[PDB]
Design an enzyme around this catalytic site. Structure first.
Site, PDB file in Angstrom:
ATOM      1  N   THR A 190      -7.979 -10.333  -1.328  1.00 37.13           N
ATOM      2  CA  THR A 190      -9.138 -11.248  -0.709  1.00 37.13           C
ATOM      3  C   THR A 190     -10.407 -10.638  -1.119  1.00 37.13           C
ATOM      4  OG1 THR A 190      -8.689  -9.874   1.315  1.00 37.13           O
ATOM      5  CG2 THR A 190      -7.792 -12.042   1.321  1.00 37.13           C
ATOM      6  N   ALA A 205      -2.104  -3.958   0.910  1.00 40.03           N
ATOM      7  CA  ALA A 205      -2.657  -3.099   1.437  1.00 40.03           C
ATOM      8  C   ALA A 205      -2.305  -1.871   1.431  1.00 40.03           C
ATOM      9  CB  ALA A 205      -2.672  -3.360   2.978  1.00 40.03           C
TER      10      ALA A 205
END
Lengths: 238, 213, 200, 228, 208, 241, 245, 206, 239
Positions: free
Chosen positions: E10, E58
């Site tokens: 993102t 992540a």
């Protein structure tokens, strides 16, 4: 006729005797005094720290092993620390698998087996460590010595290291009154015993006494410097 | 074939305060469509100051908590001091990532205090990317729980209202009420409630009853 | 593929057909479906040829050294256990047809048995392979306790004949083995001799 | 000292250990190998000290292929091992190459395998030397393997006890001109020269290799030749 | 999800105008359709010399870049001087090149002002390691590239560069359903990166 | 008894008569060839000074990095065999970083010295290629650090033993330095007071005279990380003798 | 790496003498005679029989558990001479060996082949540096297919041969002499004027008449090829037949 | 993948002891191939184990668990594996086998009584474990478990016969409404007197 | 002497001196006897107590290698414990691979071959102890074996090993062990232990006893205290 046989652990003397093991024995007895009596209520380790250097906190003579196990070393700190690693490793493994504290009578056998193993293969040495064991379990307090010959022993009390024969004599003369005592009288017994090992001109101080305790609900707690002061307190001089 | 993973359900909640860090989880342990037990807590005490909460595949939960206990003992032995809460979180991150190619299907939240005396909650993902947070819910009903926590603790989407700090009593009431509210829409929540209140003077346990359906 | 063995007092009686199929074609119609593991211990490999033959032969290899070492007759239970783990270890790739039957000096006659995959049963009679599914009812209704060797033979022959008639993956001739105090009595009932329980 | 290791050369850069192996070879049993224009014959002495021994439960000259024969002079068991595993090597060569190994690459094999023992330490050198009879494209080959790993090809040679006098005897008694049948007789003469113990039928094992491949001589045939 | 998707990337941001590099990224873990968090810092303070970036996954990003931090501090000890940007990019690329085709989803950008001046490299899961003047990765990377390409200028003044970063990040999160949260600005000035601010998109909308 | 044959140290790890291993006490005073190094551990911080005993003017002094830091808050002083001393250092550094990223804090000094001691002691596995020396390290080490102790000092000998020592001197003149230091030491010492006393005793002990190049010192205090003194700092310290 | 060989000609096996004679092999050979036992192996056209003492210098012992005839296969057996422990081990070794043979080639190992393999195992010991030669000699009997009985004996040196009749132990030279004398002249040896002659050999060479408690005899017969051992219920009757002449 | 299985094992705590049940049955799928096999182990004089699932793995567990317990006996120290310890070890072994993608296809129910405490734990093929006053496996879990919990909520403390009859009835229901059910079974009681296996018993209801 | 530096070396006279030394080490250790009767086998040791500080029951030397078979040891205690562990593992593997209790006649051979394997490598010295393996099984009665350090395995009707082996052998030769039970034979065993003991130089021992037999259903067990104490009473009476 004592020519060759005083080199290799894999070599027998023509005497039913293994020189290397006895040399490691002398190594252990070049350590420092420590005493390990016990009572019904508790098992205690009392050790004297190396008060020979100056401006140098002495070596840590009692090593934590488990919630219910405490040990002391009176030999080469090297093999001592090495074995303590395996101590903790197996205690954690037992807690991981069976989810319970490891009994002493099996851990000491583990020590004996491993310490015996190098005694046979070439290019290896006995674990030159004088080790004392204190632990509490279902059948109560326990005390064990493991000489470098991988020979353990069960005691109500005994001392290993330099000058420790004086403490052994003291424990011989006062083993009777040991089984039933409070914590404080037990610690006083141990402190007196360790004291007789000292040279008559040297007295125990707060800096070089290292009492450790483990009991019924009392997990193994090691008592460092000044903290021990009440334990030392009340003790008469020689 | 053989499926190595299974979803045991369960919900774990943590809130960080100033002198406290509430951890929150029920004990409805299920599989498929059947309740195994009503009284399996999902929050475990690690140290006087740190409490973990785990949810998801319960076998992974047990293995992870036991290995965490083992590593706590190891660190204690190696460094002669209680392992810090932040250290706990980092260790959990690395140990969880150690199974990168066979993930522990477990969601984890850590409740505990910093060593500055304040509350701190660490949230996790099943692989180990953690982050400090003021509050977090994990598990199946964490979806139902989170927006309300945002609304009250975070004061999100409020207007013209004083942002009073969250007190212990208010937090206790809030967590009780949010699980009571969760019990009626989620299927994996209820039968009991375990609440751990970690303070500066130790850890005390609290428990209530929820909807047993 | 209708191996079956029956235990009686002081000895056992075995029984199997002689037909190895490759699907719908018979490779061999006189297959010696009875393997003597030792002097007085037989078995009946069934489920596929190679993985059973090799394992049986390896079990003969083992237990031979083991019997020379103990310098005593091999115990039937010992054979059962050995040829149990030998299968269990490779339970993911092997098929099997263990119904091990044999006599021992101590505990009379035994029929230990297990399909592929490994486990242990010391039952009264053992049935395995294809035709066992068809012969369950007959055997169950017929087997009694204390039946001697001759009626054991007749019972085995009858059961195998029923399997022969109903199964299409087993056939040929009925090989039999009667293990007892003196020794093995291997006989081959074929043709007219096999039981003729006609259809009507 | 400087004579105990096999791993250090002498102060004169001179391998005492190999020399001791050589002396052991000299202490072995007499052996003779005669090349001829149409074959090669190998002869050697059977020293079954007691008649209780059987000549022919075990054997002294060992076949390797259709056309390979080996004989030695030293300690038996070393020879037996080397035969057993030179067989492995030759069997390789036929497996990889669909044609029986020529004798040369066999003696390459064997020389390499013994030499590596010399240069390993902790293993004694193979205290025995070997003889090779062969027949390649139809022409005879004769090799002697030195326990040092050296291999020499000879017109004719003799090893074992008193082998220096044997070689001298061969020098003035052999020619390239010879054939196999008389080669057998002259090799027997060589052994008789240094036999010390009055040849019977049952003291020599004889092997020959011609186009029809290597094969022993039955004791019947040993008697049969010794008749005249 | 059986616990392993971790991201898909993102709306990152980085460029290298003549007063050092500035970087920008948002904060919106997108567990499938449900937001995991609004406050996931994605700029990673590897050291007071060099900044990473979380995108694509992540846990993998965080773990591998922390390992990089270990490695580069080891380098700085052994060589007694700071590691260059290019060397750090090489280390990360070599570390991630193994475990090829095993599910890694890294999208980091290494940023720093080393002895060669500005340093900016794109390092990803499948092994791409390229420098450049302009970068952004993630789902909203396309919108970011739009606004950035129309804002970039190597001679742009610092504060206007901040404005460019804020505008780009805001537009990208405004279009993307998967990017969101509070914007983070980090300027890598002369030696030692400097944190700029962590402003919120909601307030930005009023400012815009 | 008559003296006869005896294999003495054929095997590594052969216990002496009266139980006292060979290589260990062979290396203990193979150390005594090493340069003198001084370390003082006071509340205000610690200082680590050492002679470099420049053999010849043809070296520039900057090369001899007698002192390194294991990490920003762990400085190390060494004396004796530098060769494997650097391997000791490298293990210390990698272990410190391992603790740092695995456990997000600064690895404490005591655990660093304890792990370094763990690295030693692995003498005899001559058959086993991996993990060998078959030789004890021949270098003595001094560790300074700051943590929730703050100032700390650890002395290591080539035997895997260490102490929470303070004001502990090693080198060729180690015993003389220790004796003089004992009478010189003060329980509450200010930072340059330790610098001053340690520098005076260095000037007093070493063979060559003392200048900026002759020695070096470094300090860590609870204030900030490892600092290695530069030249002009050494002149502005040795100005006062 | 390892402790290594002691520096000396006789100190270790690997070093050759100046004439390359292996000392440790001789030391093993004259280590065989420890235990005092001497065994004799003779064979006829129908049977192969091996006979040795049964020294029981203690009656705390059980005669059953003490022995030197160890069945290796149901068809093939052996005898031991030398120290007990190495004999233990080689009996184990050969049992395993023959079992592997049968498993891997599908038929009972021939006597000569088993002897060869055991000889190979013994030989490889004389190659290495911390091997010690197994100081014991082991003798075989059996019926192969057509050659009737065979007798084979390996040695620590690795040398073996087939014997019409042989012996090993202390009085080995005298046993061999008497064996040569008997074999040269009388050579039928059906079953009774057969190996019973070797019992006469053993008695004459060793001591006065034996009574069977000291004697341990195992046989294999061409018409009945089991390795099987006679007792004082049997050996006694044989030896009363022998005593009368 | 499972081959030959026993459908269900019961389990219920009560005052001073614990009793469980399991039937004489091993199915090769839908075929009752073996009708006299007992799926209960008396692990020791205080802990006892029943198993459901592939019977092969239960036999292997029988072998290994017996070996460990006899090793404990040979030690002869005084310590002994309390039932919780066996539960933990079994859980760990099953979990480790899962982690190697070679699962032990079984689902056990540990029963033990020590220190005046009745212990009842449950472990499955995936290492999932806990304790409960009553336990069930297979369709036992969907059938007998509800009745057990129903009785326990009204009466949390049970006597011997009160629990035994409840087990009898619930497994009668199993026999009625289970495909892989059989009419012959065991009942094993663990108490101060130790572990005691009684049977075979039959439902034999009217 | 001289040519006796390592295990894998033969003497000029053909003797393995560095196992003769391990053997002679046994004569430097306490005695240990074991006797086989009609019903079972009974062990007995002269456990010398080094000092009063040891707990009664320390240094147990009647190891339990398997349910139906015991171990009485003599020599290096560490050696004995390692051998006991080896025996336990051997029995465990036998049970795992075959399912029934290991025969003593086989377990003894298996351990003996291992002991022997430790006598022909220069890498390792031979073991420094000797031990008993007594077991009972109503299937085949009771059996007892002696294992020397060299590995020579022999079954005994009754054996003894230690610093006073010969005296104990002489004493045992005076019993018709083939026709008593365990109950009566314990009396004789304690009698022999007390008779052979050397109180003048090696005072303050402590008797430790165990057996295996049908009276324990073939379970090697420490002797019940009442029988032990009354047997000690009787042995003292014999003095």
């Amino acid at each position: 006729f004592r020519n060759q046989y005083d080199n290799d652990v894999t070599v027998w003397s023509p005497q039913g005797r293994i020189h290397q093991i006895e040399y490691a024995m002398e190594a252990v007895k070049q350590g420092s005094a420590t005493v390990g009596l016990k009572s019904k209520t508790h098992a205690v380790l009392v050790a004297l720290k190396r008060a020979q250097s100056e401006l140098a906190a002495h070596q840590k003579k009692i090593l934590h092993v488990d919630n219910h196990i405490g040990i002391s070393i009176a030999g080469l700190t090297a093999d001592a620390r090495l074995l303590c690693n395996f101590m903790r490793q197996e205690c954690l493994d037992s807690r991981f698998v069976f989810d319970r504290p490891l009994p002493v009578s099996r851990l000491v056998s583990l020590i004996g087996s491993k310490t015996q193993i190098p005694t046979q293969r070439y290019g290896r040495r006995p674990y030159g460590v004088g080790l004392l064991i204190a632990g509490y379990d279902d059948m109560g307090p326990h005390i064990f010595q493991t000489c470098p010959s991988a020979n353990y022993f069960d005691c109500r009390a005994m001392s290993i290291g330099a000058r420790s024969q004086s403490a052994r004599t003291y424990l011989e003369r006062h083993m009777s009154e040991f089984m039933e005592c409070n914590l404080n009288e037990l610690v006083k017994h141990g402190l007196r015993a360790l004291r007789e090992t000292l040279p008559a001109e040297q007295d125990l101080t707060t800096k070089n006494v290292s009492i450790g305790i483990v009991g019924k609900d009392l997990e193994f707690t090691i008592y460092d410097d000044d903290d021990v002061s009440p334990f030392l307190e009340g003790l008469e001089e020689r | 074939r053989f499926s190595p993973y299974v979803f045991n359900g369960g919900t774990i909640l943590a809130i960080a305060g100033e002198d406290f860090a509430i951890v929150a989880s029920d004990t409805r342990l299920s599989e498929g469509f059947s309740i195994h037990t009503r009284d399996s807590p999902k929050c475990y005490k690690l140290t006087d100051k740190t409490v973990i909460g785990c949810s998801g595949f319960h076998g992974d939960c047990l293995t992870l908590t036991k290995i965490i206990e083992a590593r706590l003992k190891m660190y204690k032995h190696s460094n002669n001091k209680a392992m810090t809460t932040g250290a706990i979180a980092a260790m959990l991150s690395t140990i969880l990532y150690s199974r990168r190619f066979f993930p522990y299907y477990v969601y984890n939240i850590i409740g505990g205090l910093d060593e500055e005396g304040k509350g701190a909650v660490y949230s996790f993902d099943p692989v180990g990317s953690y982050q400090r947070d003021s509050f977090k819910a994990g598990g199946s009903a964490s979806a139902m729980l989170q927006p309300l926590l945002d609304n009250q603790v975070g004061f999100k989407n409020m207007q013209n209202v004083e942002h009073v700090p969250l007190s212990l009593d208010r937090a206790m009431r809030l967590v009780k009420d949010v699980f009571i509210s969760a019990a009626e829409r989620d299927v994996y929540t209820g039968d009991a409630l375990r609440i751990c209140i970690v303070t500066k003077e130790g850890i005390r346990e609290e428990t209530v009853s929820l909807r047993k359906d | 593929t209708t191996i079956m063995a029956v235990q009686f007092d002081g000895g056992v009686v075995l029984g199997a057909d002689s037909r190895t199929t490759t699907g719908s074609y018979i490779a061999n119609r006189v297959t010696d479906k009875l393997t003597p593991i030792h002097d007085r211990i037989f078995c009946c490999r069934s489920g596929s040829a190679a993985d059973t033959q090799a394992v049986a032969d390896a079990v003969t290899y083992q237990l031979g050294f083991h019997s020379i070492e103990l310098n005593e007759p091999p115990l039937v239970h010992t054979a059962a256990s050995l040829f149990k783990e030998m299968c269990y270890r490779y339970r993911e790739d092997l098929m099997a047809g263990i119904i091990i039957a044999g006599w021992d000096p101590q505990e009379g006659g035994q029929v230990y048995s297990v399909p592929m995959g490994g486990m242990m049963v010391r039952q009264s009679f053992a049935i395995g392979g294809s035709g066992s599914s068809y012969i369950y009812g007959y055997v169950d209704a017929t087997y009694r306790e204390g039946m001697t060797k001759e009626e054991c033979l007749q019972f085995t022959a009858n059961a195998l004949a029923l399997a022969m008639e109903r199964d299409g993956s087993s056939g040929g001739v009925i090989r039999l083995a009667a293990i007892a105090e003196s020794g093995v009595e291997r006989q081959v009932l074929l043709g007219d001799q096999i039981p003729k329980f006609a259809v009507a | 000292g400087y004579s105990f290791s096999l791993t250090t050369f002498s102060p004169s850069g001179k391998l005492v250990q190999i020399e001791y192996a050589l002396a052991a070879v000299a202490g072995g049993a007499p052996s003779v190998g005669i090349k001829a224009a149409n074959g090669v014959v190998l002869a050697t002495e059977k020293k079954q000290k007691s008649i209780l021994y059987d000549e022919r439960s075990v054997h002294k000259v060992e076949p390797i292929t259709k056309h390979i024969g080996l004989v030695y002079s030293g300690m038996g068991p070393d020879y037996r091992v080397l035969v057993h595993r030179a067989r492995k090597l030759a069997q390789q060569y036929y497996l990889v190459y669909q044609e029986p190994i020529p004798t040369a690459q066999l003696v390459q094999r064997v020389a390499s395998v013994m030499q590596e023992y010399t240069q390993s330490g902790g293993v004694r050198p193979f205290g025995v030397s070997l003889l090779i009879c062969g027949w390649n494209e139809g022409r005879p080959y004769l090799f002697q393997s030195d326990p040092s790993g050296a291999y020499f090809a000879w017109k004719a040679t003799a090893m074992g006890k008193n082998y220096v006098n044997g070689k001298t005897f061969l020098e003035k008694r052999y020619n390239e001109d010879l054939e196999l049948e008389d080669a057998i007789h002259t090799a027997i003469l060589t052994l008789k020269e240094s036999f010390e113990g009055q040849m019977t039928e049952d003291n020599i094992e004889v092997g020959i290799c011609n186009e029809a491949g290597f094969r022993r001589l039955t004791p019947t045939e040993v008697k049969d030749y010794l008749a005249a | 999800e059986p616990g392993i998707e971790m991201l898909h990337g993102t709306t990152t941001l980085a460029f290298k105008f003549r007063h050092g590099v500035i970087v920008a990224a948002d904060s919106r873990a997108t567990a499938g359709a449900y937001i995991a968090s609004q406050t996931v810092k994605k700029v990673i303070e590897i050291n007071p010399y060099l900044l990473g970036t979380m995108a694509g996954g992540a846990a993998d990003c965080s773990f591998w870049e922390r390992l990089l931090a270990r490695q580069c501090r080891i380098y700085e000890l052994r060589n007694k001087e700071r590691i260059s940007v290019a060397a750090a990019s090489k280390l990360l690329a070599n570390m991630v090149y193994q475990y090829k085709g095993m599910g890694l989803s890294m999208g980091t950008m290494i940023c720093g002002w080393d002895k060669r001046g500005p340093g900016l490299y794109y390092v990803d899961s499948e092994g791409n390691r390229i420098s450049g003047a302009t970068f952004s990765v993630g789902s909203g990377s396309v919108y970011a590239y739009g606004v950035m390409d129309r804002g970039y200028s190597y001679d742009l003044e610092v504060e206007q560069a901040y404005d460019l970063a804020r505008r780009a990040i805001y537009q990208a999160t405004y279009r993307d359903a998967y990017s969101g949260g509070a914007v983070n600005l980090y300027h890598v000035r002369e030696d030692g990166w400097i944190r700029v601010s962590s402003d919120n998109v909601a307030d930005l909308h009023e400012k815009y | 008894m008559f003296l006869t044959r005896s294999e003495y140290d054929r095997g590594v790890n052969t216990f002496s008569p009266e139980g006292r291993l060979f290589q260990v006490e062979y290396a203990i005073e193979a150390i005594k060839l090493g340069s003198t190094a001084i370390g003082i551990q006071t509340s205000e911080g610690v200082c680590l000074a050492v002679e470099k005993r420049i053999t010849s003017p043809l070296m520039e002094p900057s090369s001899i990095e007698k002192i390194v830091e294991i990490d920003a808050h762990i400085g190390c002083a060494m004396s004796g065999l530098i060769a494997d001393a650097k391997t000791l250092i490298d293990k210390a550094r990698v272990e410190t970083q391992n603790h740092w990223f695995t456990y997000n804090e600064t690895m404490t000094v005591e655990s660093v010295t304890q792990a370094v001691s763990n690295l030693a002691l692995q003498f005899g596995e001559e058959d086993a290629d991996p993990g060998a020396m078959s030789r004890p390290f021949g270098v003595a080490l001094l560790f300074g650090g700051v943590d929730e102790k703050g100032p700390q000092l650890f002395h290591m000998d080539p035997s895997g033993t260490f102490v929470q020592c303070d004001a502990r001197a090693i080198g060729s003149a180690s015993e003389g330095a220790q004796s003089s230091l004992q009478e010189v030491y003060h329980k509450s010492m200010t930072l340059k007071e330790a610098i001053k006393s340690s520098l005076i005793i260095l000037k007093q002990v070493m063979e060559e005279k003392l200048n900026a190049t002759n020695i070096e010192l470094a300090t860590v205090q609870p204030g900030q990380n490892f600092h290695m003194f530069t030249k002009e700092e050494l002149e502005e310290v040795i100005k006062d003798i | 790496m390892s402790r290594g060989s002691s520096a000396g000609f006789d100190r270790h096996i690997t070093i050759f003498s100046p004439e390359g004679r292996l000392y440790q092999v001789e030391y093993a050979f004259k280590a065989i005679n420890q235990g005092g036992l001497t065994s004799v192996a003779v064979r006829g056209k129908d049977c192969a029989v091996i006979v040795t003492q049964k020294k029981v210098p203690d009656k705390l012992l059980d005669s059953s558990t003490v022995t030197h005839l160890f069945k290796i296969t149901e068809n093939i057996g052996c005898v031991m001479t030398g120290m007990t422990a190495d004999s233990r081990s080689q009996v184990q070794r050969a049992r395993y060996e023959a079992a592997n043979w049968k498993y891997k080639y599908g038929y009972e190992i021939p006597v000569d082949m088993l002897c060869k393999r055991i000889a190979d195992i013994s030989q490889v010991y004389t190659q290495n540096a911390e091997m010690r030669p197994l100081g014991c000699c082991m003798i075989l009997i059996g019926i192969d297919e057509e050659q009737g009985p065979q007798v084979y004996k390996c040695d620590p040196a690795g040398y073996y041969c087939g014997f019409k009749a042989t012996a090993a132990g202390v009085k080995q030279t005298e046993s061999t002499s008497f064996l040569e004398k008997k074999v040269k002249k009388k050579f039928d040896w059906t079953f009774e004027q057969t190996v019973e002659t070797a019992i006469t050999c053993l008695s004459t060479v060793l001591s006065i008449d034996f009574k069977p408690s000291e004697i341990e005899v195992g046989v294999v017969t061409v018409e009945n090829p089991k390795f099987r051992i006679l007792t004082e219920a049997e050996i006694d009757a044989h030896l009363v037949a022998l005593a009368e002449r | 993948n499972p081959m030959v299985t026993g459908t269900s094992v019961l389990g219920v705590k009560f005052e001073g002891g614990v009793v469980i049940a399991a039937d004489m049955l091993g199915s090769y799928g839908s075929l009752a191939r073996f009708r006299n096999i007992s799926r209960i182990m008396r692990v020791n004089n205080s802990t006892m184990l029943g198993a459901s699932g592939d019977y092969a793995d239960f036999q292997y567990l029988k072998q290994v668990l017996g070996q460990m317990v006899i090793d404990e006996e040979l030690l002869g120290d005084g310590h002994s594996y309390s039932p919780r310890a066996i539960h933990s070890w079994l859980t760990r072994a099953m979990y480790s086998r899962r982690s190697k993608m070679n699962p032990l296809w079984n689902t056990m129910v540990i029963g033990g009584y020590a220190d005046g405490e009745s212990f009842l734990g449950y472990v499955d093929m995936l290492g999932v474990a806990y304790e409960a006053p009553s336990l069930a496996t297979g369709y036992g879990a969907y059938l007998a478990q509800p009745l057990l919990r129903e009785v326990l909520e009204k009466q949390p403390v049970l006597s011997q016969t009160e629990a035994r009859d409840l087990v009898e009835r619930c497994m009668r229901v199993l026999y009625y409404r289970d495909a892989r059910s059989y009419n012959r079974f065991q009942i094993a009681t663990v108490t101060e007197k130790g572990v005691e296996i009684e049977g075979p018993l039959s439902t034999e209801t009217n | 002497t001289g040519y006796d530096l390592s295990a894998s070396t033969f003497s000029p006279d053909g003797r393995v001196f560095q196992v003769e030394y391990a053997m002679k080490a046994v004569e430097n250790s306490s005695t240990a006897i074991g006797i086989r009767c009609k019903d079972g086998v009974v062990f007995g040791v002269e456990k010398l107590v080094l000092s009063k500080l040891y707990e009664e029951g320390s240094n147990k030397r009647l190891f339990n290698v398997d349910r139906h078979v015991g171990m009485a040891v003599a020599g290096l205690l560490a050696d004995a414990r390692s051998l006991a562990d080896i025996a336990r593992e051997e029995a465990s593997n036998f049970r795992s691979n075959f399912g029934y209790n290991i025969p003593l006649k086989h377990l003894a051979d298996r351990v003996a071959m291992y002991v022997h394997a430790y006598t022909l490598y220069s890498a390792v010295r031979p073991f420094g102890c000797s031990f008993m393996l007594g077991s009972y099984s109503v299937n085949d009665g009771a059996q007892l074996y002696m294992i020397d350090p060299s590995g020579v395995s022999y079954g005994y009707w009754g054996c003894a090993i230690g610093k006073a082996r010969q005296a104990a052998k002489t004493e045992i030769e005076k019993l018709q062990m083939k026709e008593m039970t365990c109950r009566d034979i314990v009396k004789e065993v304690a009698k022999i232990i007390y008779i052979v003991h050397d109180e003048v130089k090696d005072k303050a021992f402590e008797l430790e006893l165990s057996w295996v037999g049908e009276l324990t259903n073939g379970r090697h067990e420490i002797v019940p205290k009442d029988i032990r104490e009354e047997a000690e009473k009787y042995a003292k009476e014999s003095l």
